[PDB]
Design a binder for this molecule. Structure first.
Ligand SMILES: [Cl-]
Ligand SMILES: [Cl-]
Lengths: 134, 135, 137
């Protein structure tokens, strides 16, 4: 029924955010969020989203987030739609008592949507995770 | 989890959405039990949209703009693609209006990547993705 | 609240797996999973994921799954993000009593993430589903 549907979509929206919404908070300098790149350290060093900090997914714990305020909202992101990293991170952040949303689209679509990137390689970095690279 | 719980989950998920495949079918056979609604900006629509689809910007979904729509048909909302949440937000507003709705995963982005035809001013010449930098 | 949030995220993962996780399973030779390609038979024969068996979604039932172990886990995959195949498939498998998870990204992102492909056309096969090829097949 309509009511059940409404609750469903709203709830789904409460656990996520898209490239468009993020691009606005960054552009307006909203400080109510902390953008966290949960991919590999070297991946972040080569290319990452503006204002984002690095915290590889397997490194999320009390020590690596001691400086993060529980008053803000954590936005996690991985490579893209084909990655589950952002989701695994969200669970860990949540377990640590944070309010968290996962970015849908990842850095892949942030770039496809013509977003700016920072890093050692920038727009020259690989668009996708390379399963064979390692 | 166990099969019983798994079955419920997957079925439920399927009840709130639909893919490019199922859409193309109802469009090919001219099914009229649906109303394809483009939620993106008015300009994007006019430039390139899915066949049989109407234009209703997400931020404009309300009683006034949905007065000619029949609660008898099923609403199918769609935005740019996997990176957009428009279709989802649109579904909530539509369900809030007492409608029966489903969001289209893939957006018009995959409708094209899947050799789908489009109508509009620029047609297949329109940009594939949303441009953050465009004013 | 954090508590509910944790339950939500954990449950979402319990019904899926990604390219990365599957690649590690294929490489480590894990036998606790059964990769099932749910697309059209022809598509599979042309290009599919290593160690995966062909079982078209519309052809899933007790006859085609009789020789599959219930002790393992079924991983379904369709073309990609814009497909519901794997999800419809998961449901049927769950109805048959199997433990199952769907692969997000499908074969599309498997190949994009530089994955190996086996089949007739291999890496030369089409990357996306062709809406027109249907009438022609
Ligand atoms: Cl108005
Ligand atoms: Cl692409």
């Amino acid at each position: 029924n309509p009511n059940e549907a409404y609750r469903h979509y709203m709830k789904k929206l409460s656990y996520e955010t898209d490239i468009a919404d993020l691009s606005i908070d960054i552009k307006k300098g909203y400080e109510g969020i902390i953008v966290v790149d949960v991919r590999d350290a070297e991946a972040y060093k080569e290319c990452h989203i503006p204002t984002a900090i690095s915290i590889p997914g397997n490194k999320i714990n009390e020590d690596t987030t001691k400086r993060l305020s529980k008053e803000k909202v954590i936005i996690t992101y991985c490579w893209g739609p084909a990655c589950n990293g952002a989701t695994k991170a969200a669970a860990k952040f949540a377990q640590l008592g944070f309010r968290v949303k996962e970015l849908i689209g990842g850095i892949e679509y942030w770039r496809k949507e013509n977003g700016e990137v920072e890093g050692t390689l920038g727009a020259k970095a690989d668009l996708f995770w390379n399963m064979k690279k390692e």
